[PDB]
């Protein structure tokens, strides 16, 4: 389980404390905490204190369990080696195993999304094999443009070389690689210096320091309208001075490029690739970019609605020439309405976003149950943001295991024994004490329509063979679609009948789905009944078995389901026509 701003630890303190390593001192804990290979992580002091508290809790708890090894308020212990308690062990163990996976996967993904508590990814003893393996797994894996990666390849180098003063002695360990970078050797080995100089000229011009600006300028730097799109809230320097600067240190875009394979193949590009891992692992800092760039917003991410702020004639075009056009009261009326909407948007443009931030920051400043929170809903931009899906997968995956652990408390624990006797002393009866076999289920409500003679005939016999024509494939996916459309609406009503208005609204869903279905039916049935020009020939009798007369017309007058007064369970209303009409009136 994760929220916007969660600490999921990448540690498995379990196995260290399983084998017996116990941490009490802070320096030993810190050496325990860090990875010694081609990945040297640093965690923010908030998560450092959080993680030391994690080790305190874990060490003291494994102490408690090892001290007990040598229940609910009213759920006891059965003897050991029972099948109940043993498979209860099993369910709890499987739950905790899968959830160690969930937590550590959450740790890894929070770490590699470039989250705040994980402020620095180092690569110290990183052999070129690891450089290329991390590149093709986080940049040549995460990227979409082989030209844009070659853009980043020298844009990031420009930024780091420009601010080689702003990184501590610790981050100085990219500088050797940044400075031994090869330029203008041969064609497909490395890109020239004209590219480096375009990217350095732009960084000197736009004061680019953090990856939140690196990406937005990578998205607006090759558009011709870079002028207004990158137009910073503090406007940048002029070309006529940044150009004498770049000339003292020694614009049009660099198109001449090596292959992108040159970057991860070249034995020379590798100090240029430490830079590329470095700008994505390090250099990436949380800082909102579109207070600085007010125009790259609408292109980078989607625009605002109210920031874009003859409607009658637009609508007359939409409604076409077949409806008589809006006369000279209603044209002005629609126009006044539209201008008023535009005005109210003009008013509630900026306040909307500001209050949206503060609404989503209340549940963040509260040490409180997370009601409004998300997986990634900062008030800033992280272009390395893992999707909601690559989080929700393991989210639900851990949620079900949480249910499974919840489940494993009846196996390992028992109520009192004469309490159990008293429970059994009231025998469960199908006559009175049993819950009804019809269940408000989506299968039950697909079955009622599948119980139909008419729907079943139009799906099996009626609608033509789905396996011959591809148009039959879509026409049958549409039959199943509307059948299921009614099915889920009936399912929802079934579930939420007692709810005074929710029942009525889901009954509206029912009436809309079933109206679509019965219109479908009254046309896709007279279609199958118009397929009788195959049999209206001089095979005048064809003695017994005709399909329409009456293998298909025998089934009689059809009952549409927008009208079929169906009750709560999915069977016709025991209540009368009046009562059911009132019960199922509009939410209006």
């Amino acid at each position: 389980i994760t929220t916007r701003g969660q600490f999921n630890p990448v540690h498995d303190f379990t196995y260290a404390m399983e084998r017996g390593v116990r941490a009490r001192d802070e320096k030993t804990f810190e050496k325990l905490i860090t990875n010694p290979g081609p990945l040297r992580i640093a965690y923010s002091p908030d998560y450092l204190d959080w993680l030391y508290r994690c080790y305190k809790a874990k060490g003291k708890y494994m102490d408690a369990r090892a001290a007990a090894e040598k229940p609910p308020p009213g759920m006891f212990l059965r003897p050991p080696n029972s099948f109940r308690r043993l498979s209860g062990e099993m369910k709890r163990k499987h739950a905790q195993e899968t959830l160690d996976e969930v937590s550590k996967a959450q740790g890894m993904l929070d770490l590699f999304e470039r989250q705040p508590q994980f402020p620095a990814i180092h690569i110290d003893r990183c052999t070129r094999f690891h450089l290329v393996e991390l590149f093709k797994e986080m940049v040549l894996e995460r990227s979409l443009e082989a030209v844009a990666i070659w853009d980043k390849a020298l844009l990031y180098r420009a930024i780091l070389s420009e601010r080689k003063a702003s990184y501590p002695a610790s981050f100085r360990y990219i500088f050797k690689a940044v400075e031994d970078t090869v330029f203008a050797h041969s064609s497909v080995n490395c890109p020239s210096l004209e590219a480096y100089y375009y990217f350095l000229y732009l960084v000197k011009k736009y004061y680019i320091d953090n990856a939140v600006e690196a990406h937005v300028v990578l998205r607006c730097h090759r558009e011709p309208n870079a002028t207004d799109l990158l137009f910073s809230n503090p406007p940048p320097k002029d070309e006529v001075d940044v150009r004498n600067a770049i000339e003292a240190l020694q614009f049009a875009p660099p198109s001449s490029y090596p292959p992108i394979e040159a970057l991860w193949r070249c034995e020379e590009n590798v100090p240029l690739l430490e830079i590329l891992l470095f700008g994505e692992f390090n250099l990436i800092v949380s800082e909102n970019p579109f207070v600085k760039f007010p125009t790259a917003h609408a292109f980078l991410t989607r625009p605002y609605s109210t920031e874009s702020s003859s409607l009658a004639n637009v609508i007359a075009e939409k409604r076409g020439h077949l409806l008589p056009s809006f006369p000279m009261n209603v044209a002005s009326a629609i126009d006044g309405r539209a201008q008023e909407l535009r005005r109210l948007q003009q008013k509630h443009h900026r306040d909307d976003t500001v209050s949206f931030q503060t609404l989503l920051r209340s549940t963040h400043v509260d040490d409180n149950p997370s009601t409004f929170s998300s997986y990634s809903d900062w008030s800033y931009f992280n272009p390395r943001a893992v999707r909601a899906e690559e989080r929700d997968r393991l989210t639900r995956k851990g949620i079900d295991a949480l249910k499974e652990y919840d489940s494993a408390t009846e196996d390992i624990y028992r109520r009192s024994f004469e309490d159990a006797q008293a429970s059994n002393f009231q025998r469960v009866t199908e006559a009175w004490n049993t819950f009804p076999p019809y269940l408000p289920t989506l299968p039950h409500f697909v079955s009622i329509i599948k119980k139909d003679s008419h729907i079943s005939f139009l799906l099996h016999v009626g609608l033509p063979e789905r396996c011959s024509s591809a148009e039959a494939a879509a026409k049958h996916k549409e039959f199943e679609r509307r059948i299921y459309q009614l099915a889920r609406a009936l399912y929802h009503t079934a579930l939420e009948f007692h709810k005074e208005t929710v029942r009525r609204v889901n009954r509206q869903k029912v009436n809309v789905a079933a109206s679509l279905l019965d219109n479908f039916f009254e046309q896709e049935w007279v279609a199958m009944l118009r397929e009788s020009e195959s049999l209206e020939n001089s095979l005048e009798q064809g003695a017994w078995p005709d399909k329409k007369t009456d293998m298909a017309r025998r089934l009689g007058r059809y009952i549409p389901f927008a009208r079929r007064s169906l009750d709560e369970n999915g069977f016709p209303t025991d209540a009368r026509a009046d009562d059911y009409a009132r019960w199922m009136e509009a939410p209006a």
Partner: protein, 230 residues
Amino acid sequence: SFRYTNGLVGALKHRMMLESSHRELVRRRFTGHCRGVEVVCSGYGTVLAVRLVDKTVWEPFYRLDFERIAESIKAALWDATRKIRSAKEAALNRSLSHNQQLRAQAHLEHWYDEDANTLQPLAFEALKHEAATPWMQFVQFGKYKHAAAVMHSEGPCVTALDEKDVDPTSIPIGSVHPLFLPALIQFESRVDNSLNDDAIRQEQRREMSRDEQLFWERVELIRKGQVATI
């Protein structure tokens, strides 16, 4: 009084008739016929055979087109299937109509919870009954006398069934309420399918003995309390 036993009498009459319907729809065949096709199927939906007409007048109609051919095949097969389905529904609509106790316990949902998709004979439990061999088609159906007799030696479900097995006022408990067969087995006797009377009465009096000690513990205790507080 005895509303429990009365509703139980009713539910057992209902289920007796429904199992009579089960084996009645077993001991028969059903036939669909939509264009030239004669699809004979079991009581469990298995296709027994697919024939044409003796004079085959639909032959100027099929000319072999294969499209109308498959159409009419599936159409007559569905015809035989809906035959079976409406027969399983009718064998239920008769039972509920002629049950005097399920009609005194007036409910609409009675006519609706059971349908040919849920009454005992079903088309996906077909194989384990049809492709069963004599002894097992005796023991499924709960005929252990005949099962022992055959042990002392397609879809052929019609082997084990005879007209005595379709009179519901004879078929035993495990088959009458199959939702509870593994729990009524312990009162299903082995030699004869009749009720295991020693089983039922012995179980009852074991539970009655137990409850008697339970009761006298409580008289002892509540009297101790009456003496203590009074």
